[PDB]
Design a protein around this ligand. Structure first.
Ligand SMILES: CN(C)Cc1cccc(C(=O)Nc2cccc(-c3nnn[nH]3)c2)c1
Ligand SMILES: CN(C)Cc1cccc(C(=O)Nc2cccc(-c3nnn[nH]3)c2)c1
Length: 260
């Protein structure tokens, strides 16, 4: 049923859809193009923030460490960082800005703290994600060119990783709770996965978008009554200037929720 429905959604959508659900009630999965690569865009911000949280397990004051924000450090979307130019933000502030407001300058500071895009990849490998790759900084990591392997992952790999980070033991308990608190306070997500879920359900999520009408969301969800779910919805289109389609992610989420 659900496979067919997702196929029909994709057919009407004008693009390529990738879905991965993990239902922690039974550890079962529903995949659609689950092993195909998609450009992550800002959903990669979750891995960067998590990597800094992991660092903070062995440097208890790390999240209070200041990072200089210079005018030259501002990129193309800096709703929080622009307020702090010629001053400092802590790594906590940068993680919160990157996750909850999707600030690109904040993401760049996280990447630098990790040693570059490959440092984020190295963390992914250390927590068992063999698929994730971060190759570039903001804003170029959002070019989302069809067939380009840079800055991609698969829906299956991202769902497994998001589960391990938010519900499992990839991070210490304090750090896992901090990450969940941040995702639950996201400001950008009401039109995406969460728009397709019953209103009684709660969730945390991280959105992403780029060229090729690339429109993404990854979420951890607490249904009314059921064990938590982890859900990744990735969508990308053939033309570079395609419009975003958050409604397609809401539709995919709705299909998944009605199929439980
Ligand atoms: C070039 N590198 C600096 C990149 C980087 C950045 C942040 C975290 C890690 C990492 O793998 N951290 C990690 C991964 C798995 C376990 C532990 C650990 N064990 N005990 N305390 N921390 C730490 C890597
Ligand atoms: C400048 N180009 C050469 C690369 C490029 C092309 C298209 C979009 C972006 C971008 O940064 N988009 C962007 C920037 C910040 C946040 C989000 C976002 N968060 N959640 N959904 N979209 C998306 C970059």
């Amino acid at each position: 049923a659900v496979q067919q429905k997702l196929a029909a959604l994709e057919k009407s959508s004008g693009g390529r859809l990738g879905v991965a659900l993990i239902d922690t009630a039974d550890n079962t999965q529903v995949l659609y193009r689950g092993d195909e690569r998609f450009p992550m865009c800002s959903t990669s911000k979750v891995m960067a923030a998590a990597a800094v949280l992991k660092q903070s397990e062995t440097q208890k004051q790390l999240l209070n460490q200041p990072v200089e924000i210079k005018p030259a450090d501002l990129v193309n979307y800096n709703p929080i960082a622009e307020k702090h130019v010629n001053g400092t933000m802590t790594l906590a502030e940068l993680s919160a800005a990157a996750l909850q407001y999707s600030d690109n300058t904040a993401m760049n500071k996280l990447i630098a703290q990790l040693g570059g895009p490959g440092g984020v990849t190295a963390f992914a490998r250390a927590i068992g994600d063999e698929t994730f790759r971060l190759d570039r900084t903001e804003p170029t990591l959002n070019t989302a060119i069809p067939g380009d392997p840079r800055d991609t992952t698969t829906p299956r790999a991202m769902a497994q990783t998001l589960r391990q980070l938010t519900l499992g033991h990839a991070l210490g308990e304090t750090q896992r709770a901090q990450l969940v608190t941040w995702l639950k306070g996201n400001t950008t997500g009401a039109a995406s996965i969460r728009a397709g879920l019953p209103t009684s359900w709660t969730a945390g999520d991280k959105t992403g978008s780029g060229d090729y009408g690339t429109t993404n969301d990854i979420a951890v969800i607490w249904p009314q009554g059921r064990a938590p779910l982890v859900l990744v919805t990735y969508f990308t289109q053939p033309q570079q200037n395609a419009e975003s389609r958050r409604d397609v992610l809401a539709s995919a989420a709705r299909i998944i929720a009605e199929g439980l």
